[PDB]
Design an enzyme around this catalytic site. Structure first.
Site, PDB file in Angstrom:
ATOM      1  N   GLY E  30       0.991  -0.845   0.131  1.00  0.00           N
ATOM      2  CA  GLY E  30       0.120   0.114   0.096  1.00  0.00           C
ATOM      3  C   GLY E  30       0.804   1.069   0.136  1.00  0.00           C
ATOM      4  O   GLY E  30       2.365   1.637   0.216  1.00  0.00           O
ATOM      5  N   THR E  31       0.377   2.261  -0.786  1.00  0.00           N
ATOM      6  CA  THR E  31       0.780   3.470  -0.627  1.00  0.00           C
ATOM      7  C   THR E  31       1.315   4.293   1.257  1.00  0.00           C
ATOM      8  O   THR E  31       0.482   3.474   2.052  1.00  0.00           O
ATOM      9  CB  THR E  31       0.025   5.104  -0.995  1.00  0.00           C
ATOM     10  OG1 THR E  31       0.059   4.901  -1.856  1.00  0.00           O
ATOM     11  CG2 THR E  31      -0.322   6.100  -0.213  1.00  0.00           C
ATOM     12  N   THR E  32       2.536   4.681   1.651  1.00  0.00           N
ATOM     13  CA  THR E  32       2.796   5.135   2.878  1.00  0.00           C
ATOM     14  C   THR E  32       2.303   6.259   3.738  1.00  0.00           C
ATOM     15  O   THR E  32       1.642   6.567   2.559  1.00  0.00           O
ATOM     16  CB  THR E  32       4.172   5.688   2.527  1.00  0.00           C
ATOM     17  OG1 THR E  32       4.843   5.845   4.069  1.00  0.00           O
ATOM     18  CG2 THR E  32       4.668   7.083   2.208  1.00  0.00           C
ATOM     19  N   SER E  75      -2.907   2.718   6.157  1.00  0.00           N
ATOM     20  CA  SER E  75      -2.668   1.892   4.336  1.00  0.00           C
ATOM     21  C   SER E  75      -2.520   0.773   4.220  1.00  0.00           C
ATOM     22  O   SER E  75      -2.732  -0.090   5.317  1.00  0.00           O
ATOM     23  CB  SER E  75      -0.262   1.637   4.758  1.00  0.00           C
ATOM     24  OG  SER E  75       0.359   3.506   4.812  1.00  0.00           O
TER      25      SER E  75
END
Ligand SMILES: *[C@@](C)(CO)[C@](*)(O)[C@H](CC(C)C)NC(=O)[C@H](CCC(=O)N(C)C)NC(=O)[C@@H](NC(=O)CCCCC)C(C)C
Ligand SMILES: *[C@@](C)(CO)[C@](*)(O)[C@H](CC(C)C)NC(=O)[C@H](CCC(=O)N(C)C)NC(=O)[C@@H](NC(=O)CCCCC)C(C)C
Lengths: 243, 249, 222, 233, 244, 204, 196, 244
Positions: E30-32, E75
């Site tokens: 996932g995105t940080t 995230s």
């Protein structure tokens, strides 16, 4: 020839592998704990390891205040640990409301151990990967230590220890009670019983401790409490004067 | 949610009920317990196997009272026994005492326990209980009785028997020594000797649990007044009372 | 009914009459209004007879199972909490009025419960239609630090006040004594001040007085 | 590998993927292409309809939800019927209880939350349809994209379906043009026609083949079929 | 034989729940996102991967608010994080209903914690595919938390999870050392922009959007509030001046 | 209106030297209308005799019920129900319907087969156990019976004697009640045998 | 009943009579209408004996469970729990409750909960049948930030008037003092307060 | 989910056989043999316990013979645990019937109902079947003496003489060879003993291994009588036939 290891049903040998694998889970945190009885108190000592510099040390705890009188220490992963705690607190409050007197240590233990047994027989529930150690000064039996496991087993102790390096602490204590003859720590104040427990933790593990390496719980007449880093610090200055 | 609404004990091609067979294996692995029936009493006995030299053996009772006239002992898994004892006590009230104002006869409380174990054989999503029980009791109309209850749910009446580890060698020992003219003191004497073959370690009132179903104990009732109440027939012996018969054994 | 309970220095005593009524007619001339909950917790009951007898048994049965589960002597506060919560639940439709007393590992206790589920605590208590006659005696003769024998006397005297002065009370006096270090003693028919005087005549009929139409033998066998 | 981790949506793969959800996504790629696009005044849907035979009818791809909001479908038609119906109730509830026209941003959050509950519980399969929802609430014109995983995304313009990558590069290229089409519905519909033919390959879009929907400021959500779309061919 | 990783509630022979560890992988993909606790409040920030020029700016919000004083960012799998907040929102409202007072952060943590642990207990449920960073200002000071798919949660001085968790923590730990006497609420916002920009090396192929929020006793009056316009542009310009 | 008062009927039980006696009238009516002169109110389950007064449908039900319950008891226990024990089964059975009771007045009589002790008991409609050494009364003319027994009764009566006493109690009580009478029956119980006699009374 | 609770400089004080009645018969003349729900949160009970006991037992339970998890509850929280039980079950309860508690931050706080289930935060509150007669007295006498001596006098004088006039009030006057110093129990006998 | 661990107890084989019913019938063929013979003037039930011990109590024991009713009785082959669950409904059912019709239940109606309960576990619920076969021996004013058998399948049939349990094939042929219609009860008593004595897997057929019952209408009482033979009685009858 396969699934008798995935749910809580007997193996050909008569074993429950999901229970056995749960015991293995209790040592994931790599943290040892011990418990001793004084004249009129009970002390729990557990190791406090905070490996990350980004954590808040004061939130990292495996000791819980179940009620005004009962305290609990857990060897196991924290989410299972906090699960068990919440139930113990609810079970304690309910007992008092229903029966008109505070729940005893041995009774709470039995209860939580009866629940654990259920997860051992019903298939949709997994056991919890935790060993629960309850402590109090019971208004009938005095200082008390009772311990429950994923098997649903529970028993009363003169003293106990739990974790990866359990046997080191255990044999150490066994040798003390063969020497002293009695089945408790002969001391008036709880302050000198906390000192005893830390001393025997160091002498059995073989490692020195600072104020942040330890986590302490004390049970006295009508009160269970945890010591701050400062009260432990005061307790560590006291041990480093006798030696 | 519980998706286990189907049996976990089923029949295998040969006609074996696998889970029950295995439960019985667990009973053989458990510590020896026995029971003997004299003309004027019954005795149940077992060994207290200690988990740690630090554990207090008093806080763990392998012998339990179910009714004032009925006692239970086991071999196998301890936790399963414990919860069975809780249910056995409750069922004796709900299904009997709350109906008739008296306690269930030995054979009927056994029957109730058997049923609880049978359901663990057939209900959705449960394993059988991993215990064999020995129930010893008295009732006005049957006299003294001793029963064995298996994980399947089956029950057999016994003059004497043992269960668990050395049960095979112990049953052979009992066959030699049992007769129909035994007094209760003798039955205790045999019980101690039979248990000596099982125990390797310390053999005293600290590591051996023993209870009887004998005469009514008026001083164990807790109150005087009702002439029809004469006190429980179940009596658990103390550490000291056991050692008294071991000094001349 | 008349029922009373008196605390003394080393325990508690409870007492009751033995009159049971159905309207203006005496149903039972000698029934027991004292109830064992556990060996050392006894209970006095007034109100609807079957209501007191049943709530006593339900809780007594529960208290026995609790005591086994916990391996502890039952406490008077436990029996008190279970009774009040049950009675309260039924909003007073279970018309049981209870004086509950006894000894346990925490000392001696005396309580009262009403049908709607409220509880009072005290050194001297009474309930029932004879409550007022008895309480008058209690308010007149109660002092602090009573001996066991003084407590019996007072409680017995209080029940007598009800027996003589209240129509919903009569016959005998049942007492129960619960002392701290001892086994509780139940004194069924402690006093019998209402023994019926010997009849003036006998009414044994000369055999064959009654006219018979048909005679047969009944069968029980199988 | 994949064999053991696709039996139900309750199971994770070792890589961290949910295969049942991912196969549901594949049903969208097999579906017929549909496109969305907006300006500040109007939001537009253009959809290509798919027939079985030349004797069958071209199954409809656009659904009304309320007088300001509706959507286009790609994938399983029954699942679009279930999902559009829901939004119709959620639009209905907002009106009756709050006298409110349920905003298109919360429309998506409700669809996201409903779709998610199918991906975590045993027995329930994911939904097998993608949705392009256009609205005009109290904050101008909006267009949303719905994936049966739960991921809802507010966009100026986008396409889903077979070969829909062609249309998506077109809208990406002509952003500065179509977003400024304010006040003229026609030159936004005509911008959406030139989008969908970028995803054509075999057939030329005909009068009973094309389906167009429009919502906006002075226009409510309406459906255009038959000789009523003849001008945009 | 094995197959210990096929059913959720099951323990492996080494005492692990393989399904949870598999969910962690979804989070790592996932995105940080991070959280910085300061001397009177907490600052949340997150990366927003701009796939196409067609994604509307400022429009696809990720940071959610529970109640009025708590905020959450996550995230991993978004829909799971949404679901976790719906439960968070119910849980806090139920607490305000019975106890009048808004829910304390430690109390709220355990609530999400007992809920996530619940989904590692039964085979008929899948573990959550999110790590969640959340917190706010209550009766006694600020609190910052991080919740794992296992149900584990602790208090943090700084928290980071997702794709760029490595770069973030390494930068977070320099802050705890260079500012031992607490950081200010204003400073942390700027410093949150930098951390996100420097943890974008882990994905520097696609352009991204920045989303920040803060809860601070003296700056936002103890209520959760997003960073808009002038303060937001100020934080961007600090990241650009630090990256160069 | 009063269910205890629609059908009528009375029952009386009485103890003596090594014997009990239980008795009832045969009337089944509806208010003023005499309907059946055969309706018996005593039943037995083994050696345990029960009598029921009150609303007759409930009488009939509770019979069938206690036959159902004693049958199952005897099969599980492998022995007949005893008077003391039966009494307890009657109480718990009635109290089970505490807030919707059976409109009955049960009476239990018999001799403990083990101890040989004579036993009688009375109940109210919700199962309050009224245990007595001398006599128990039930029904629409309980008042008349209470006065009859309290006067005529003396303890330790012989089987023959007890019959005279219980019959004269019932008869004179039934003749002051408009809803009792129309015939009558008296069971005399010994440890070994049971003797059942029909009485000759007024038929008005 | 006659009952009241009063805030003051150092904390808060609760006061009550000790009479319970069934009509005109005094069922109990030494009743404790002052009930602990937490260490330093107490309440005043008026209305049904059965109802107020059953409510208080539940509150004590809820606050005990609150303490296990979240620590020491505020007085406001204790009011909310009472409020919820009284309001939501208004049809089945006759209970009027005064909640009083000492917090070390909030000092003294009093909340009143009448038949409706509404909550009102006040500097002092009176309730119970006997309170009607002392509305005039209390309004004209009460001042904010009195001393402990002064407040004990104010409660003693007020409840004595209530007991004097109301037949449903009497016995002893019980008080409970709540400050940082801890909990204090006070009792005043007829021979003392009747003479005032 | 749980799908993985489901045996599916109520399905057909490709052959059209119920797996679990078959495997349960295989279980019974191992249990002690039970025999029922019906004569003109009564019915006989006998059974053999599997082998046991001397220590075992024989006076209190009644494990394979049960009284269902005043006039109905049963012999058991299989799990006693399972058998008692069914015996308890059978008893309740008869009583229900009596409470309703004020007449003792006809033997077939009782048999049918149990067999219908058994059939249930065969078709729905996903539970295992009862590992029990019953012989029924009873009397009613319609058919007089009746003898039935029912097995785990839910199938029941009427018999003049029958066996369940171990070695039924061997035992059936021996009965089929010596049974006749005009048989007296005491002739059928001898047959049942001889038959068991010839199929016994043990060395000798002794009293402590046997259970015996008769449902004979009294040749003087003129009504139906049940008799469960007590150890001493069996001991006596075994010397009569010539087995000592
Ligand atoms: C005093 C004798 C006052 O009457 C006692 O309180 C006594 C209690 C003991 C436990 C017997 N009470 C009674 O005997 C009551 C008094 C009748 C009553 O309370 N009412 C005004 C209703 N009597 C009974 O309990 C009698 N039962 C009934 O009258 C049937 C009530 C059915 C309720 C729906 C029994 C003694 C026969
Ligand atoms: C004052 C004595 C004035 O009533 C108090 O408010 C006091 C409250 C304390 C906390 C007990 N109330 C009582 O003593 C009440 C008065 C009746 C009432 O307020 N009710 C709404 C019922 N008494 C009771 O609660 C008594 N129970 C009753 O059921 C009252 C019987 C009234 C006759 C129908 C109990 C003390 C037994």
């Amino acid at each position: 020839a396969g699934y008798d290891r995935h749910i809580t049903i007997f193996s050909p040998e008569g074993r429950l592998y999901q229970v056995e694998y749960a015991f293995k889970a209790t040592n994931q945190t790599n943290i040892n704990s011990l418990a001793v009885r004084g004249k009129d108190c009970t002390v729990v000592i557990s190791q406090k390891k905070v490996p990350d510099k980004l954590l808040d040390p004061t939130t990292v705890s495996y000791i819980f205040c179940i009620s005004r009188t009962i305290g609990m220490v857990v060897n196991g992963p924290i989410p299972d640990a906090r699960n068990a705690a919440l139930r113990a607190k609810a079970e304690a409050a309910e007992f008092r409301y229903k029966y008109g007197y505070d729940m005893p240590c041995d009774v709470l233990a039995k209860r939580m151990a009866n629940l654990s047994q259920i997860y051992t027989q019903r298939a949709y529930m997994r056991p919890l990967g935790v060993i629960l150690t309850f402590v109090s000064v019971d208004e009938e039996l005095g200082p008390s230590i009772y311990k429950t496991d994923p098997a649903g087993y529970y028993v009363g102790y003169k003293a106990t220890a739990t974790g990866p390096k359990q046997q080191e602490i255990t044999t150490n204590l066994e040798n003390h009670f063969k020497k002293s003859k009695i089945d408790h720590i002969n001391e008036e104040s709880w302050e000198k019983v906390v000192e005893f427990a830390i001393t025997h933790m160091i002498d059995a593990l073989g490692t020195e401790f600072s104020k942040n390496d330890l986590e302490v719980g004390v049970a006295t007449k009508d009160k269970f409490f945890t010591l701050s880093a400062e009260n432990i610090e005061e307790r560590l200055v006291a041990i480093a004067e006798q030696d | 949610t519980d998706r286990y609404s189907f049996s976990l004990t089923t029949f295998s091609p040969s006609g074996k009920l696998g889970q029950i067979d295995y439960a019985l294996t667990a009973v053989k692995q458990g510590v020896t317990s026995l029971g003997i029936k004299a003309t004027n009493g019954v005795v149940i006995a077992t060994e207290k196997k200690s988990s740690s030299p630090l554990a207090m053996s008093e806080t763990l009772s392998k012998v339990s009272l179910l009714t004032p006239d009925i006692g239970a002992v086991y071999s196998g898994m301890g936790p399963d026994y414990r919860v069975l004892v809780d249910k056995s006590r409750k069922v004796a009230h709900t299904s009997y005492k709350r109906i008739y104002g008296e306690y269930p006869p030995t054979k009927l409380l056994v029957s109730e326990v058997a049923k609880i174990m049978q359901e663990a054989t057939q209900s959705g999503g449960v394993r059988p209980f991993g215990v064999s029980l020995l129930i010893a009791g008295h009732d006005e109309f049957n006299g003294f009785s001793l029963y064995q209850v298996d994980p399947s749910g089956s029950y057999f009446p016994w003059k004497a028997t043992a269960i668990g580890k050395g049960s095979v060698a112990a049953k052979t020992f009992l066959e030699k020594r049992w007769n129909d003219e035994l007094e209760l003191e003798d039955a205790i004497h045999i019980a101690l000797l039979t248990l000596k073959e099982s125990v390797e370690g310390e053999f005293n009132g600290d590591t051996i649990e023993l209870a009887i179903i004998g005469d009514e104990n008026p001083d164990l009732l807790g109150y005087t007044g009702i002439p029809t109440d004469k006190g429980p027939r179940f009596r658990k012996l103390t550490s000291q009372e056991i050692n008294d018969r071991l000094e001349a054994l | 009914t008349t029922i009373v309970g008196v605390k003394f220095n080393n325990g508690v005593v409870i007492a009751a009459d033995t009159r049971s009524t159905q309207g203006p007619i005496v149903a039972d001339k000698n029934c027991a209004k004292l109830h064992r909950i556990s060996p050392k917790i006894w209970c006095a009951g007034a109100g609807t007879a079957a209501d007191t007898e049943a709530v006593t048994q339900l809780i007594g049965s529960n208290i026995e199972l609790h005591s086994l589960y916990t391996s502890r002597e039952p406490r008077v506060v436990s029996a008190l909490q279970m009774l009040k919560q049950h009675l309260f639940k039924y909003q007073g439709h279970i018309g049981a009025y209870l004086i509950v007393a006894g000894v346990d590992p925490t000392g001696s206790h005396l309580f009262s419960i009403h049908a709607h589920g409220s509880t009072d605590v005290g050194y001297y208590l009474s309930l029932g239609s004879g409550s007022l006659a008895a309480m008058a005696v209690l308010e007149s003769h109660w002092k602090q630090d009573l001996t066991k024998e003084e407590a019996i006397k007072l409680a017995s005297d209080a029940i007598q006040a009800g027996i003589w002065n209240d129509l919903g009370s009569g016959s005998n006096v049942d007492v129960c004594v619960m002392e701290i270090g001892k086994d509780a003693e139940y004194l069924r028919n402690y006093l019998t001040p209402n023994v019926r005087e010997e009849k003036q005549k006998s009414y044994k009929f000369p055999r064959g007085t009654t006219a018979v139409l048909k005679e047969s033998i009944v069968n029980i066998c199988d | 590998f994949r064999n053991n981790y696709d039996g139900d949506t309750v199971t994770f793969s070792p890589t961290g993927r949910l295969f049942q959800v991912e196969y549901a996504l594949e049903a969208i790629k097999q579906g017929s292409v549909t496109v969305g696009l907006r300006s500040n005044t109007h939001a537009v849907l253009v959809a290509l309809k798919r027939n079985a035979d030349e004797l069958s009818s071209y199954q409809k791809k656009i659904i009304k939800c309320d007088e300001h909001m509706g959507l286009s479908l790609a994938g399983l038609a029954p699942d679009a019927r279930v999902l559009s119906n829901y939004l119709r109730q959620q639009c209905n509830y907002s009106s009756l209880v709050f006298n409110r026209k349920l905003a298109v941003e919360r429309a998506g959050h409700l669809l996201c939350d409903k779709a998610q509950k199918n991906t975590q519980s045993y027995g329930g399969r994911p939904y097998g349809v993608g949705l392009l929802i256009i609205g005009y609430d109290k904050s101008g014109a909006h267009l949303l994209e719905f994936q049966p995983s739960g991921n809802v995304t507010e966009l100026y313009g986008t396409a889903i379906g077979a070969r829909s990558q062609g249309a998506k590069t077109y809208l990406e290229r002509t952003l500065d043009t179509f977003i400024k089409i304010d006040g003229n519905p026609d030159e936004l519909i005509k911008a959406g026609v030139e989008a969908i033919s970028q995803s054509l390959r075999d057939e030329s879009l005909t009068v009973d083949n094309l389906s167009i929907a429009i919502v906006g400021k002075d226009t409510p959500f309406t459906i255009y079929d038959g000789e009523a779309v003849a001008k945009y061919i | 034989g094995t197959g210990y990783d096929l059913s959720n509630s099951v323990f492996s022979p080494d005492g692990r729940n393989f399904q949870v560890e598999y969910a962690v992988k979804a989070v790592e993909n996932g995105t940080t996102s991070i959280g910085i606790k300061c001397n009177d409040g907490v600052v949340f920030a997150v990366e927003k991967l701009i796939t196409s020029k067609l994604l509307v700016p400022q429009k696809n919000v990720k940071i959610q608010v529970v109640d009025r004083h708590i905020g959450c960012v996550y995230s991993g799998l978004i829909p799971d994080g949404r679901h976790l907040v719906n439960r968070g929102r119910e849980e806090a409202a139920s607490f305000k209903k019975l106890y009048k007072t808004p829910i304390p952060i430690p109390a709220f943590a355990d609530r999400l914690g007992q809920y996530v642990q619940a989904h590692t207990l039964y085979n008929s449920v899948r573990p959550f595919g999110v790590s969640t960073i959340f917190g706010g200002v209550d009766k006694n000071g600020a609190h910052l938390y991080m919740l794992e798919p296992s149900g584990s949660y602790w208090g943090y001085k700084g928290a980071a999870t997702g794709k760029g968790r490595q770069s973030a923590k390494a930068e977070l730990e320099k802050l705890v050392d260079h500012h031992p006497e607490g950081l200010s609420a204003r400073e942390a916002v700027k410093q949150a922009a930098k951390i996100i920009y420097l943890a974008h090396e882990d994905n520097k192929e696609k352009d991204f959007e920045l989303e920040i929020s803060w809860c601070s006793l003296s700056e936002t009056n103890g209520l959760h509030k997003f960073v808009k316009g002038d303060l937001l542009q100020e934080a961007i310009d600090f990241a650009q001046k630090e990256i160069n | 209106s009063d269910p205890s008062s629609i059908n009528g009927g009375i029952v009386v039980a009485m103890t003596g030297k090594d014997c009990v006696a239980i008795a009832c009238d045969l009337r089944l009516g509806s208010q003023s209308l005499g309907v059946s002169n055969k309706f018996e109110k005593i039943f037995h389950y083994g050696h345990v005799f029960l009598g029921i007064t009150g609303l007759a449908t409930d009488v009939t039900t509770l019979n069938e019920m206690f036959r159902y319950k004693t049958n199952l008891y005897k099969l599980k226990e492998e022995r007949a129900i005893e008077p003391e024990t039966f009494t307890q089964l009657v109480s718990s059975s009635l109290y089970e319907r505490r807030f919707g009771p059976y409109f009955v007045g049960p009476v239990v009589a018999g001799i403990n087969s083990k101890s040989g002790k004579p036993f009688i008991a009375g109940f109210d409609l919700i199962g309050c156990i009224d245990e007595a050494k001398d006599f128990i009364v039930s029904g629409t003319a309980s008042d008349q019976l209470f006065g009859m027994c309290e006067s005529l009764y003396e303890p330790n009566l012989e089987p023959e004697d007890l019959f005279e006493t219980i019959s004269q109690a019932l008869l004179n009580a039934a003749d002051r009640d408009a809803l009792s009478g129309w015939g009558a029956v008296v069971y005399i119980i010994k440890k070994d045998e049971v003797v059942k006699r029909y009485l000759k009374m007024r038929q008005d | 009943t006659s009952i009241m609770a009063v805030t003051f400089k150092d904390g808060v004080i609760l006061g009550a009579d000790s009479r319970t009645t069934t009509g005109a018969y005094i069922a109990n003349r030494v009743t404790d209408k002052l009930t602990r729900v937490h260490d330093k949160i107490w309440c005043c009970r008026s209305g049904s004996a059965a109802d107020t006991q059953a409510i208080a037992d539940i509150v004590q339970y809820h606050l005990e469970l609150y303490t296990s998890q979240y620590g020491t509850p505020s007085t406001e929280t204790a009011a909310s729990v009472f409020k919820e039980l009284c309001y939501e079950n208004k049809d089945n309860l006759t209970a009027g409750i005064i909640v009083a508690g000492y917090d070390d931050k909030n000092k003294g706080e009093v909340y009143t909960i009448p038949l409706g289930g509404s909550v009102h935060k006040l500097p002092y509150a009176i309730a119970g049948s006997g309170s009607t007669f002392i509305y005039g007295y209390c309004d004209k006498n009460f001042r904010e930030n009195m001393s402990k001596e002064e407040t004990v006098d104010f409660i003693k004088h007020s409840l004595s008037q209530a007991i004097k006039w109301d037949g449903s009030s009497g016995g002893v006057i019980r008080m409970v003092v709540l400050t940082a110093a801890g909990v204090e129990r006070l009792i005043f006998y007829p021979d003392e307060y009747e003479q005032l | 989910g749980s799908r993985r661990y489901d045996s599916r107890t109520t399905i057909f084989s490709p052959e059209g056989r119920l797996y679990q019913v078959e495997y349960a019938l295989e279980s019974i063929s191992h249990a002690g043999t039970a025999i029922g013979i019906m004569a003109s003037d009564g019915i006989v039930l006998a059974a053999e316990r599997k082998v046991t011990s001397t220590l075992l109590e024989q006076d209190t024991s009644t494990e394979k013979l049960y009284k269902l009713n005043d006039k109905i009785a049963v012999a058991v082959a299989g799990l006693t645990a399972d058998a008692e669950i069914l015996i308890n409904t059978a008893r309740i059912h008869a009583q229900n019937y009596l409470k309703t019709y004020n007449e003792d239940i006809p033997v077939e109606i009782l048999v049918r109902r149990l067999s219908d309960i058994k059939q249930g576990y065969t078709q729905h619920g996903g539970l295992r079947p009862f590992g029990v076969s019953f012989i029924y021996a009873g009397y009613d004013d319609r058919y007089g003496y009746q003898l039935y058998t029912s097995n785990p399948s839910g199938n029941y049939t009427g018999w003049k003489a029958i066996s369940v349990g171990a070695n039924t094939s061997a035992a059936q042929t021996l009965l089929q060879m010596d049974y006749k219609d005009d048989m007296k009860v005491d002739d059928a008593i001898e047959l049942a003993l001889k038959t068991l004595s010839k199929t016994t897997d043990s060395s000798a057929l002794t009293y402590d291994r046997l259970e015996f019952a008769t449902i004979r209408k009294g040749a003087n009482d003129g009504e139906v009588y049940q008799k469960i033979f007590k150890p001493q009685e069996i001991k006596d009858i075994l010397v009569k036939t010539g087995i000592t």
